[PDB]
Subunit: 90 residues, 4 copies
């Protein structure tokens, strides 16, 4: 139910991740990115994790061994920005 | 079920924590300490969290608003060392 | 004994990213900067002709420029702007 | 233009704690060190009489000494050893 995975991304950036699963499904992920501890909740309909802090809305997708960090700024006019697109589990 | 709490400890050390609960009980905690991401599992009998990595066995107790970071070295002769004893939720 | 001026500055950037910086000056001129960015300690040397700091490691070539309190973090594999709205706190 | 030598050294300590260090030297002598410890960027000035580095912030007074490849991180509120088994990797 708790798993530590390190990802190596573009520019050799290392993203440490903790995954928390519950009863056969993803539940939460905790990341350390951009100097922050980022807690995210699994959204099954979106097939990705979304930050619990709506004012600092990182998203994390780990799919088929490739993971992506993105972020949506708080203002409703903002568009989602991809921050790391070449992360792979070490 | 997912909560971010920052602790301020001795020497003004800041320990970021994510708590993960499941069905009314503690389940996991993720800490950033000593430059590491540390994932810990709740042990109800011990009333504390214990690192999932037996080779780097941090322990975390958050009790009555006071939290304590300790660590047990891998060798069986080691004794538990208290690393931070004056942590309080910010 | 020599005491090059050492200054800590924290920058707050877009997404409220905090970039801690130590500046080390020597005899009235910039000399070095140390940043914590993307989970890394990055040491940089001042390049006066370029008017910016360049990572000492050519294999991980961050650049850092501060002009009028606004700073930019960029990176060159072999230049991409990583943070463009850093402001001295 | 002046180029004080800049060196990155990583120390591996007890509990496998990694302390990243940047050393900045000036004209053949130690001058400054920048550490990342306990989640902080800590800038320190060399004190030749004490043969160690002392934090520039007196309110958070870390000290760092490296002698023969073995280093100690300590701290003085107003001295506690925090890491005593650091070794240059």
């Amino acid at each position: 139910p708790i798993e530590r995975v390190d990802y190596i991304c573009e520019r050799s950036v290392v993203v440490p991740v903790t995954y928390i699963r519950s009863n056969g499904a993803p539940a939460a992920a905790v990341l350390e990115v951009e100097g922050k501890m980022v807690a995210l909740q699994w959204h099954g309909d979106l097939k990705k994790y979304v930050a619990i802090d709506e004012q600092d809305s990182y998203r994390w997708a780990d799919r088929g061994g490739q993971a992506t960090l993105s972020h949506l700024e708080a203002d409703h006019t903002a568009k989602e920005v991809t921050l790391l697109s070449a992360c792979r589990a070490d």
